[PDB]
Amino acid sequence: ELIKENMHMKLYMEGTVNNHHFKCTSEGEGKPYEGTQTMRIKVVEGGPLPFAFDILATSFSRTFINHTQGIPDFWKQSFPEGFTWERVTTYEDGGVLTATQDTSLQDGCLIYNVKLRGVNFPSNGPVMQKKTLGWEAATEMLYPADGGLEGRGDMALKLVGGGHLICNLKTTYRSKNPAKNLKMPGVYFVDHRLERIKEADKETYVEQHEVAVARYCDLPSKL
């Protein structure tokens, strides 16, 4: 089996948010089977960013989700070929961020390539004004659909002074070997905690940590 108790990752990101173009790279590692990982990210082009780095946080790692209770790991089963995802995140103040990621496994290292585009972030809003303080924990609902898996979930971005701006995520996850016979799961959930550990140089260097666990709904069913 190709996914080994400890893994390294490399990431290239390019995007544009409200007409501002930028690139990031990052390097990290994690414990795929624990559900834990750490990324050290550099804005290498278009920095410093004139928007909140937080809107990029989710676009930096599906291999590193601890699967409890035998839920088949959609993303771990996809190697060596790997997988992609495509997401649209819609903020309640009109901002819309679309992201595409390709995940591959080359020479024992996980390699991420992301493209994204953000539009209609209000000029006066907390993203464009950099008034945000990270994400709350969140739960994503996942279910088979269209040959792949779909994810749906809201997330809450913390605002300076209290307050939250909410967005809703719609994701499609596809395996790169479609022929591969998958054990698919029912409907399930992944709990995510995405934390900024450190930053420097006007968010031009950022250390991010994520814990993510896959689980069924532990409630009794009168059915």
**Residue 177: which CATH number?**
2.40.155.10
Q: What is the C-alpha to C-alpha distance for residues 206 and 196, in angstroms, rounded to an integer?
A: 7
Question: Which residue, 72, 22, 31, is CA-closest to 9?
Answer: 31
Task: For strands 66-67 and 205-215, give the pairing.
Answer: parallel
Pairing, β 148-159 against β 96-106: unpaired
Distance CA 27, CA 11 (A): 6
Q: What is the C-alpha separation between 20 and 119, in angstroms, rounded? A: 10
Q: What is the resolution of this structure in A?
A: 1.8
Q: Whole domain around residue 102: which residue ranges?
A: 1-223
> How many structural domains does the chain have?
1
Cα radius of gyration rounded to whole Å, the chain: 17
Dist CA 24 CA 114 (whole Å): 10
